[PDB]
């Protein structure tokens, strides 16, 4: 079986920065793309960002372009999401997701696209 | 969208990356090109990025995308390779060089956006440092072979085998017994084929504009074995 270990959430005053990180370990097949989603309590899952493993092309949500910066680590099956200029309504649980199958076309942003999901990490922005 | 054979009606860009370890010598290769399954035509250029290749190029032709075989219309129900796309398939191999070492290969052939990617990991052992392989005694050429495909009932894939004839500088021939497993990556249904074979032809060339150790590979592959 396979597991995605999130890390690096936390607590930050507005305007600050935080870095989420996710590492895929185990698994029978090699990574094709990794993404981050987020959900607040009683609200609906939102796509945050993603990155293709071979090409390295980044795809962000509207609320994240410019502020957020997703990247790989030496193709070490590790992915990072650096968030700058954070804000209160960015508070939520952040999920790392992985796609190990192949795909044809653009990176899609629907949760079904991603096979393997992390348990979630708490990101809170407060005064 | 398009799925399965629908994705091969035209030209498809290809990417090949490989990491190798033969008797401790360690190397990487990158490849680019395109495939057209309408003609059964395959064109790739390979470059050793870690300097220079510790083995002869011809021995890795097999290891370096049978989804580009031309399956004639009356056989299209036996094209396992295309049926597993875009999700992809795994390709495992063990290659026995007679009276010499052996290759162990595992690769993932799958679409990643607009490109068909074959990423491999190779590990060689038990070779003779003066033998034909590590002694670079192989003619830079390739012959034509029949690739024999059979449905692997235990799994959800296929078993494949064939023997390659690598010509030798002294006029002899070195046989490389190939044993191959393919299983799909997705969970969607695939095509399990009746016994058949692929008629393979290959020609190795050199780009005179190329300074690094490299190989230019062109392949023609057509399926056969059934009667209307
Ligand atoms: Cl948005
Ligand atoms: Cl899908
Ligand atoms: Cl025989
Ligand atoms: Na021959």
XYZ file of C-alpha atoms and ligand atoms in Angstrom:
359
model
C 0.000 0.000 0.000
C 0.944 3.694 -0.188
C 0.844 6.623 2.227
C 1.096 10.396 1.822
C 2.577 12.135 4.865
C 1.749 15.820 5.099
C 3.746 18.172 7.301
C 4.577 21.799 7.876
C 1.180 23.326 8.497
C 0.793 25.628 11.451
C -0.235 29.015 12.778
C 0.712 32.400 11.345
C -0.293 36.029 11.713
C -1.878 37.631 8.618
C 0.489 38.629 5.830
C 2.930 35.903 6.885
C 4.027 32.751 5.104
C 3.716 29.004 5.657
C 5.036 25.945 3.816
C 3.118 22.691 3.418
C 5.029 19.581 2.378
C 3.985 16.107 1.266
C 6.061 12.989 0.573
C 4.806 9.898 -1.244
C 6.316 6.673 0.101
C 5.756 3.114 -0.994
C 3.489 2.392 -3.917
C 3.889 0.201 -6.968
C 3.918 2.961 -9.578
C 5.802 6.223 -10.172
C 4.281 9.646 -9.637
C 2.729 11.601 -12.509
C 1.333 14.651 -10.697
C 0.782 15.976 -7.179
C -1.693 18.565 -5.951
C -2.976 20.392 -2.892
C -6.627 20.823 -1.937
C -8.209 22.596 1.019
C -11.494 22.462 2.916
C -12.910 24.518 5.766
C -15.477 23.055 8.185
C -18.956 22.901 6.699
C -17.639 24.124 3.342
C -16.717 22.517 0.050
C -13.355 21.138 -1.082
C -11.309 23.645 -3.094
C -8.444 23.023 -5.490
C -5.322 24.994 -4.540
C -2.502 23.922 -6.861
C -0.737 21.065 -8.597
C 2.367 20.146 -10.578
C 3.229 17.542 -13.214
C 6.057 15.248 -12.178
C 7.888 14.878 -15.496
C 7.257 18.234 -17.187
C 7.181 20.274 -13.973
C 4.448 22.621 -15.208
C 2.513 24.319 -12.402
C -1.247 24.912 -12.222
C -2.791 27.201 -9.587
C -6.283 28.194 -8.534
C -7.428 31.783 -8.998
C -7.189 32.601 -5.279
C -3.555 31.403 -5.211
C -1.720 32.701 -8.295
C 1.263 34.892 -7.460
C 1.075 34.202 -3.734
C 1.559 30.421 -3.722
C 4.504 28.526 -5.203
C 4.498 24.743 -5.703
C 7.630 22.743 -6.478
C 9.416 19.389 -6.286
C 12.490 18.167 -4.391
C 15.116 16.488 -6.587
C 12.245 14.301 -7.840
C 12.535 12.828 -4.326
C 8.815 11.959 -4.324
C 8.436 15.136 -2.235
C 6.343 18.207 -3.062
C 6.206 21.617 -1.388
C 3.594 24.395 -1.397
C 5.018 27.729 -0.227
C 2.272 30.219 0.661
C 3.097 33.917 0.926
C 0.892 36.869 1.858
C -1.468 34.565 3.733
C -4.856 35.689 4.979
C -7.690 34.715 7.349
C -10.054 33.209 4.768
C -7.172 30.964 3.663
C -7.676 29.108 6.957
C -8.586 25.470 6.301
C -7.406 21.852 6.329
C -4.952 21.299 3.469
C -4.827 17.925 1.715
C -2.022 16.604 -0.473
C -3.141 14.433 -3.388
C -1.223 12.238 -5.818
C -1.873 10.846 -9.297
C 0.192 7.831 -10.317
C -1.695 6.798 -13.466
C -1.028 8.291 -16.853
C -3.270 10.913 -18.398
C -3.893 12.611 -21.737
C -4.639 16.317 -21.884
C -4.413 19.132 -19.356
C -4.024 18.606 -15.645
C -7.579 18.459 -14.319
C -8.524 19.894 -10.926
C -11.300 17.543 -9.857
C -10.677 15.427 -6.722
C -11.478 12.178 -8.558
C -8.459 12.788 -10.796
C -6.128 12.118 -7.848
C -5.894 8.534 -6.572
C -4.147 8.911 -3.234
C -4.965 11.488 -0.555
C -3.208 12.655 2.590
C -4.921 12.978 5.947
C -4.886 16.755 5.978
C -2.908 19.416 7.787
C -4.210 22.374 9.773
C -3.415 25.882 8.508
C -4.783 28.710 10.662
C -4.388 32.462 10.125
C -5.327 34.716 13.043
C -4.355 37.967 14.710
C -12.482 11.913 -24.612
C -10.206 9.717 -26.696
C -9.112 6.521 -24.970
C -7.267 3.401 -26.035
C -6.397 3.073 -29.710
C -8.002 6.471 -30.392
C -4.804 8.100 -29.071
C -2.463 6.576 -31.686
C -4.185 7.476 -34.974
C -1.525 10.123 -35.616
C 1.962 11.144 -34.526
C 2.634 10.878 -30.793
C 5.715 12.417 -29.109
C 7.828 10.025 -27.053
C 10.111 10.466 -24.049
C 12.532 7.839 -22.732
C 14.556 8.116 -19.520
C 16.618 5.255 -18.115
C 18.796 4.631 -15.060
C 21.264 1.774 -15.294
C 23.706 -0.228 -13.184
C 25.777 -2.871 -15.005
C 28.440 -4.638 -12.917
C 28.635 -1.492 -10.794
C 29.051 0.942 -13.685
C 26.277 3.514 -13.391
C 24.738 5.611 -16.150
C 21.661 7.491 -17.335
C 20.174 7.924 -20.808
C 17.540 10.272 -22.212
C 15.617 9.819 -25.438
C 13.204 11.775 -27.594
C 11.289 11.097 -30.784
C 7.863 10.133 -32.053
C 5.784 7.112 -32.982
C 3.133 6.552 -35.641
C 1.151 3.341 -35.134
C -0.608 3.885 -38.473
C 2.648 2.887 -40.194
C 4.070 0.940 -37.260
C 6.947 3.425 -37.385
C 9.090 4.463 -34.421
C 11.909 7.028 -34.362
C 14.031 7.822 -31.302
C 17.362 9.485 -30.535
C 19.202 8.472 -27.357
C 21.968 10.278 -25.461
C 24.033 9.060 -22.518
C 23.844 11.993 -20.106
C 26.333 10.600 -17.545
C 29.153 10.814 -20.053
C 29.398 7.614 -22.007
C 27.658 4.245 -22.205
C 29.438 1.390 -20.342
C 27.714 -1.204 -22.565
C 26.976 -1.494 -26.309
C 23.996 0.483 -27.573
C 22.410 -2.478 -29.443
C 21.756 -4.389 -26.206
C 19.265 -1.740 -25.007
C 17.186 -1.372 -28.176
C 14.556 -3.723 -26.738
C 14.524 -1.990 -23.355
C 14.242 1.505 -24.852
C 6.996 1.154 -26.700
C 5.148 -1.701 -28.393
C 1.942 0.356 -28.270
C 3.100 1.754 -31.634
C 2.892 -1.577 -33.442
C 0.562 -1.523 -36.442
C -2.195 -3.972 -35.519
C -4.001 -4.640 -38.828
C -7.720 -3.944 -38.753
C -8.746 -7.597 -38.433
C -6.608 -7.969 -35.270
C -7.508 -4.812 -33.360
C -9.163 -6.893 -30.615
C -5.693 -8.182 -29.609
C -3.823 -4.877 -29.094
C -3.289 -5.063 -25.349
C -0.779 -2.204 -25.371
C -3.045 0.488 -26.818
C -6.023 -0.745 -24.791
C -4.268 0.103 -21.504
C -3.751 3.739 -22.512
C -3.711 6.487 -21.405
C -3.365 5.025 -17.890
C -0.409 2.917 -19.032
C 1.213 -0.438 -18.376
C 4.284 -1.872 -16.652
C 6.943 -3.705 -18.683
C 9.205 -6.110 -16.789
C 11.960 -8.049 -18.540
C 14.838 -10.423 -17.877
C 17.376 -10.687 -20.702
C 19.796 -13.633 -20.730
C 23.015 -13.176 -22.691
C 24.270 -16.697 -23.377
C 27.470 -17.439 -21.448
C 27.373 -13.923 -20.003
C 25.407 -11.793 -17.560
C 21.768 -10.723 -17.640
C 19.634 -7.582 -17.626
C 16.685 -7.039 -15.288
C 14.303 -4.312 -16.439
C 11.199 -2.636 -15.065
C 9.522 0.231 -16.899
C 6.301 2.242 -16.895
C 4.845 3.205 -20.278
C 2.088 5.793 -19.923
C 0.866 9.135 -21.204
C 1.866 12.215 -19.202
C 0.036 15.116 -20.847
C 0.819 15.270 -24.566
C 3.672 12.741 -24.540
C 4.067 8.977 -24.234
C 6.725 8.341 -21.576
C 8.737 5.138 -21.089
C 10.709 5.403 -17.828
C 13.004 2.459 -17.109
C 15.303 1.123 -14.407
C 17.902 -1.425 -15.531
C 20.309 -3.542 -13.486
C 22.954 -5.828 -14.989
C 25.029 -8.451 -13.180
C 27.373 -11.393 -13.771
C 28.967 -10.056 -16.966
C 32.485 -10.913 -18.139
C 34.663 -7.786 -18.190
C 36.346 -9.182 -21.328
C 33.223 -10.715 -22.869
C 31.314 -9.414 -25.847
C 29.102 -6.986 -23.902
C 31.523 -5.146 -21.617
C 34.249 -5.727 -24.210
C 32.274 -3.636 -26.726
C 32.473 -6.417 -29.309
C 28.998 -5.902 -30.818
C 28.391 -4.663 -34.347
C 26.389 -1.421 -34.383
C 23.434 -2.979 -36.178
C 20.186 -4.823 -35.536
C 18.290 -7.673 -37.171
C 14.583 -8.498 -37.462
C 12.764 -10.709 -34.958
C 9.345 -12.132 -34.116
C 7.942 -11.065 -30.731
C 5.605 -13.768 -29.407
C 2.688 -12.512 -27.269
C 0.469 -14.709 -25.086
C -2.324 -13.964 -22.619
C -1.200 -14.168 -18.978
C -4.298 -15.607 -17.331
C -2.997 -15.530 -13.749
C -2.497 -11.757 -13.985
C -4.572 -9.373 -16.107
C -1.798 -8.919 -18.686
C 0.411 -10.771 -21.158
C 3.601 -12.814 -21.350
C 6.083 -12.099 -24.146
C 9.270 -13.827 -25.273
C 11.734 -13.778 -28.173
C 15.458 -14.199 -28.840
C 17.601 -11.340 -30.166
C 20.631 -11.964 -32.394
C 23.326 -9.360 -31.708
C 25.952 -9.686 -34.436
C 29.590 -9.764 -33.324
C 32.629 -8.066 -34.837
C 34.247 -11.471 -35.517
C 31.268 -12.695 -37.569
C 29.630 -14.817 -34.858
C 26.252 -14.205 -33.180
C 25.381 -13.632 -29.512
C 21.874 -14.694 -28.487
C 19.950 -12.653 -25.903
C 16.912 -14.544 -24.599
C 14.098 -12.113 -23.733
C 11.352 -12.856 -21.197
C 8.796 -10.122 -20.671
C 5.735 -9.351 -18.545
C 3.180 -6.595 -19.121
C 0.386 -5.665 -16.716
C -1.841 -2.567 -16.814
C -1.693 0.356 -14.410
C -5.332 1.429 -14.478
C -8.230 -0.681 -13.265
C -10.233 -0.375 -16.487
C -10.827 -3.452 -18.644
C -8.147 -4.323 -21.192
C -7.897 -6.677 -24.182
C -6.439 -10.100 -23.434
C -5.106 -11.347 -26.789
C -5.130 -14.672 -28.563
C -1.657 -16.026 -29.249
C 0.004 -13.882 -31.916
C 3.305 -12.177 -32.699
C 4.825 -8.869 -33.784
C 7.113 -8.685 -36.817
C 9.935 -6.374 -35.728
C 12.603 -4.632 -37.802
C 15.188 -2.187 -36.506
C 17.967 -0.032 -37.938
C 20.552 1.866 -35.893
C 22.031 5.087 -37.272
C 24.266 7.981 -36.239
C 23.643 11.729 -36.382
C 26.849 13.209 -37.887
C 25.947 16.500 -36.154
C 26.171 14.731 -32.781
C 29.213 14.942 -30.502
C 28.152 12.827 -27.510
C 27.865 9.048 -27.414
C 24.417 8.440 -28.872
C 22.141 6.165 -30.881
C 19.506 6.914 -33.510
C 16.913 4.133 -33.572
C 14.226 3.508 -36.172
C 11.750 0.647 -35.748
C 9.046 -0.926 -37.921
C 6.618 -3.208 -36.077
C 3.544 -4.977 -37.473
C 1.358 -7.531 -35.718
C 0.593 -10.932 -37.218
C -0.519 -14.442 -36.357
C -4.281 -14.654 -36.964
C -6.307 -15.551 -40.040
C -9.471 -13.664 -40.997
Cl -10.423 30.305 -6.729
Cl -9.675 9.358 -14.953
Cl 14.712 -21.414 -31.016
Na 19.872 -11.544 -38.510
